Amino acid sequence: QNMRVAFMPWNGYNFEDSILVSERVVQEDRFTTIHIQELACVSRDTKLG
Amino acid sequence: ARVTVQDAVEKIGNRFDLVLVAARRARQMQVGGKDPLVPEENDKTTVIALREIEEGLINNQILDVRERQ
Amino acid sequence: TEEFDAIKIALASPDMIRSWSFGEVKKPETINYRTFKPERDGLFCARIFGPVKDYECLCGKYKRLKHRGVICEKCGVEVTQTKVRRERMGHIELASPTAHIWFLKSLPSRIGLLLDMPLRDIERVLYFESYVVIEGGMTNLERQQILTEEQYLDALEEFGDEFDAKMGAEAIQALLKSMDLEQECEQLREELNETNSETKRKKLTKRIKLLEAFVQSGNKPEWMILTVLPVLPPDLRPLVPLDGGRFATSDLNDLYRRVINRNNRLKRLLDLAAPDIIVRNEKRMLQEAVDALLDNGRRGRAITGSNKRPLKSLADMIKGKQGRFRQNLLGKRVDYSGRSVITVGPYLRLHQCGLPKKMALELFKPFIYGKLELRGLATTIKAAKKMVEREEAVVWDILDEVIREHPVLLNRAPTLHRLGIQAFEPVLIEGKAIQLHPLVCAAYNADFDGDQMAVHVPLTLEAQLEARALMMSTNNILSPANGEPIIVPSQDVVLGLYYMTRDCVNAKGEGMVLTGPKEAERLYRSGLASLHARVKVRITEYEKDANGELVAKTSLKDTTVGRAILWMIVPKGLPYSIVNQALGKKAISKMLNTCYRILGLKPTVIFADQIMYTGFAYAARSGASVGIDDMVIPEKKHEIISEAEAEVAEIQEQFQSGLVTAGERYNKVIDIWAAANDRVSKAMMDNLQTETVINRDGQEEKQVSFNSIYMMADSGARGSAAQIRQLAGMRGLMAKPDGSIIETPITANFREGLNVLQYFISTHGARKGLADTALKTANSGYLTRRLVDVAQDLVVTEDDCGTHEGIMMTPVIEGGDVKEPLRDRVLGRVTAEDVLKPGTADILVPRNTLLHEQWCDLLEENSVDAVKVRSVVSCDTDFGVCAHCYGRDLARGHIINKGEAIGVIAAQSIGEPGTQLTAESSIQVKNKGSIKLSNVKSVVNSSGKLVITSRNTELKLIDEFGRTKESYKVPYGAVLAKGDGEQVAGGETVANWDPHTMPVITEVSGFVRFTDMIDGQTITRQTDELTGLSSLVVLDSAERTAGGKDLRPALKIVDAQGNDVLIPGTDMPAQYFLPGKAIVQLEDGVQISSGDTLARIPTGGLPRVADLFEARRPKEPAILAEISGIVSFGKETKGKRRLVITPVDGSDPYEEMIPKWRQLNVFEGERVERGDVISDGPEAPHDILRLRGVHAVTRYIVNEVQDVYRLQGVKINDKHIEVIVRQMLRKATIVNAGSSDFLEGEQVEYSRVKIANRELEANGKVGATYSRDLLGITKASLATESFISAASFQETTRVLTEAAVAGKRDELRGLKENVIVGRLIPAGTGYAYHQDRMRRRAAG
Amino acid sequence: HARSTGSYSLVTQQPLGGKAQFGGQRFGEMEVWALEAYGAAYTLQEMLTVKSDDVNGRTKMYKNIVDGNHQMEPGMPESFNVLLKEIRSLGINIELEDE
DNA sequence: GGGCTAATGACGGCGAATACCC
RNA sequence: GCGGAGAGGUA
DNA sequence: GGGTATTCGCCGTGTACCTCTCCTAGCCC
């Protein structure tokens, strides 16, 4: 997604390649992804039953 | 937090047996056989023992004399 | 746990193996796969190895703990704790005695030479193709005769008796049992007393040493053949049942099953008395299975079921990276540890780190439980657990309270050097990322682009104290490699400070006078003055000039607002000047340096934190950004490019006509393009650098621009001039795959747009770069591993050994100037002896004193040039080094403390930086000085030249006050101009010689006389007309014609009368053997001038460092002289020309063969010195050490490595290279006799202590002279005393076999052994402990 | 990821490696060297025995920590005993001597 | 499901084992 | 459900 | 026969971490 960036050092919170982000980004819910795990339970036939 | 131990190493210049004497003292302090000679400021017993070492009250010889006494 | 020491290794006898074993595994089955109870007999058996479940038998008759020794009558399983199933070993009774693969296939085949039988024969026997007649009684056949099938048949039929032959490992065991160790040993000593020949004497000495080792150790040779085979406890080779009735098994289960199968089938076949062929096949099959068990991979590589990969055998489990020692015994996996992504956290103190709540709770769980129970919040431990799993406010309060002073260890994945692990005090924070203090990133090489870090918790009290004292960030500000600071501000900080200190011609508040920095800040933050604006301020600096008292000096300085704002932080002791400048990267670094040297640690720490905060803040206030217009295309670029294109066009057209070769045209184009690149770069730098033409009140002025990209360049925050060029200029020349340089460069830049070709080329460049870094990293890692490995055991044990030896250290002045000054080279080294002023009895430094900054400055005030300092290599201490011989240099400033493991610090410091490692016509004096010649003996001739007659001649430069600035090496035959005394102007040509031509120089005058220079036989007169042209060819040994092979043409130098003029002082008849390719152009009849031409004669980085440290013969070594004196020729043309060195005093008989291709640099009648060059090329360190001795080889290695390292601009102190070298030459070879075995390679330590014991005894007794040896770190480590150290990283099989046969005993004595065994290392905090234990033995 | 105590491995009784199963960080040989460069003997010692490999040591240390005392009892790592057993499985007798 | 049986695409270094050259 | 291969990715 | 080359074969080739599939097999009763 395309967002408004400003190139400047902001009290070394973007010191190294790190990135600073605005609470509006989480508010607007624009970097929230959906993930999906699969789980499997298998019932086999043992000789005890 | 005690950010530098430079004065404690200036007391004993080896900088290694410093750790041993401070460990013995802090172990006598944790298992409550002894009492601290310095007013604690909510420090744990390690930094207490270092604070005591830097003030000149405790070294190896004081430990030996007090133990035999 | 017992208190033990001395791990002993030896061959296991079959009775001992039976002793360990608890039962026989008869059938290969393990478990019923249906009911998971183990087999009644099998690889997993309860009656042999132990009960599956604690204290209960298999059939279930006895299950209670009341019974602890009973063995159930039905199931023979004893009732005990299942843990024992982890230690009980079993055994298998082999029907056919089997060979141990390790003792056979290991490169020196110890069965082979022990039996004195070549490996080929043993292999012939083992695969069952032929017999061997072992002690065939009274017949006509020897003892090691190989016999073919039908030869054995006809022999057996003819000779029924007195014919003893057998087959296989049982035959070999028979050979071993019947051997008389001592009789053969004594016979061998007699043979050695009778034999004088190199190679046979070496094989004999190896064998005699093997025999002596067996008779001393008490191992009988027959044990190399296995009769009983032990089987590993089951829980160590599990057969775990996967969910779903299927099983997962280690490969050892498969191998054991196969072995048992083949064994049982062979047993049945033996009971059946099957024919020999079949039993032989079965015995072979059992051999493959067993040898696959022991070491799978030395045969047809018995692969696994349906996977095509060779399965892993025991040797594979031990040896190798993935297997063992590396993986599980030096590379464990601790508890109370975590991992997460790293983040900035500027607000932190230097000694702290942001730690997520949830990880901190998880790590400190048991601490939480303890504190919760102490406070009574929880009745029992389970209630504490439940309280932690709900995570109530009380839990967080307890966590905050416990965390208070508890330090944690932070580590970053590639721990290159010891600063890869540091301790911090954690501060609980939200989030899932670990917060790392910015200043320490440089130490960690950490970057916030997804780098992760691990966090460990020290548990015991001694560990806590050690983490906070030794490892804490604030205690490690100086790099252990060189003394300089590690924590220097990196990029944002330095940018902010740079912005703050730079001044501008005109701004708001120009030239107003401020009473101090505080009102400067008043002005700046209120917007009544610019952050940078020239101003007069009154400032009170403090100076500790007295004995530790601070004196305030208060005056008016002309500075910027910004410099005042910065001054607020600076501690008292520092001069104002420090901040007064532009304050870039270097300036800030040296600021920190001075602050440390003057005040000490704590002020430096707090000052660094302050610097970080102010830099970050004001960088943010600056608002520095990067727009497309910030990078200014030079206005005159297009002209430069069009001009260069016109020039290249003219040169190419002028090529098509054919006045210049292709190579010459290439060179011309490349040079013109390079010049154009430099032109555009300089134009761009002029445009960008000082372009702010801003106006003061009236007229204009110009100043260093405020272009953001330029500030980023100049400050040293990011980018170099090269990248600025790459942005705004033409991006220079490129290299094609093979290294050749493309003719047309990339004229475009990233501000503009490249096109397909230029991009493509740069793509190649970047690709090659990346691949380089990958392979470079792998090689680095390997090199640093060897280094830390070899030098681990070295520890500072003694305070002062008291030796007078030392190395005379000078500043390495390579050619033009002083690449590295004295002061840094000597700082922190103790002196070997007092040095005197230029006037005797004027002692400048008492006997050994640590040379700190004050002494170095004092030496600067005087004019000391070279200082002899005690070095670690020459240290006298046994089993370690002494504090004084080492010196001070550390992350701290003081003399080294007893106990410190200097080997590892040296190895790490040399290894970690190793990841950025990849004409001569006229001499030109750089600075006006006096010329001085060293190690020369000249003879002024008639032409008026100071003729150089020495090959080792040097021309140094003494300055006004007696110091050697420049140094050059002047070879034989270089025309000279100025002699001795003359002052030479700047850049004036003092010497001259032909680059691609080495002339042969005559010493005397007269007529050239032809001796053995016969016409027709070896030379062919093809001569031209009057003008004196000829083609007389004196060919070399290789190129001489077929007829003139043995007739050697010569030129004797006679005078005008005829008599051979003799070299002054010597009687030698001058018989000049014309060397190779002697083109006699100037024919007979032209008066020879002094200087006539007789004969025209036409790697670095990581591999170079690894090769220097491994002491690898560079495949074409130069040759040296052993003794001095008249050399001479000998028996001619045998295939390698003989040179016999004849000593004027010493004995003659030293001959050296020389190949035909070798060219000689010295004349026959010349005066050589020992270890002078005879042939040109790279010298192998071994010869230099052997001839010149220890200090020479150590200086050579140190300088050669330091050259590579400084070429990249990485500073390392020489002491580390010295420590490694000292670890390299640990071994010596005995040449005399008296207490040793007269030839054994023995460490110099044991040899020295033997001499010391003789000295300690009142009687002189025997002292034996020894010669030093230098071994490369891989082999040197292989020949270590302790066998666990060597086994830890090398071929495990080889060293294990050597120690097993030798019966070696390990006292552990080292660091790595103690680590492996899990006791206290003998270094540092544990040194006292081990010293204490030393007192505990042999005491009361 | 973080762990205090959890499941340990079968053959060499060290904690599992990984994220799926709790798993501890790998204190590798380079880290060992880092600690050796300092005089840090007790930290390395606990890291080598009490933190991973010594079974009796780890349980005694858990109990000791719970008791509010911070001492230790290093013992010999189980992996070393496994090593002895594996080398002994060859024809090599390797014994821990005593005097 | 259960029961029974069991090929080719690294490279360098080094030291020992023949090949051969006088 | 401890392991080991193969594939990919991170620094 | 003894010293020198040459083939030959073994041994090594960075750390830390994160995903997924796949795991004794074939034939006969």
Ligand SMILES: Nc1ccn([C@@H]2O[C@H](COP(=O)(O)CP(=O)(O)OP(=O)(O)O)[C@@H](O)[C@H]2O)c(=O)n1
């Ligand atoms: N195959 C690899 C590739 C990378 N790494 C690791 O990634 C980092 C490379 O930094 P680097 O110097 O190469 C790039 P950076 O530090 O960010 O500075 P720059 O971008 O301004 O140039 C090092 O810590 C390496 O250990 C590795 O272990 N193996």
Ligand SMILES: [Mg+2]
């Ligand atoms: Mg990174």
Ligand SMILES: [Zn+2]
């Ligand atoms: Zn029973």
Ligand SMILES: [Zn+2]
């Ligand atoms: Zn010494």
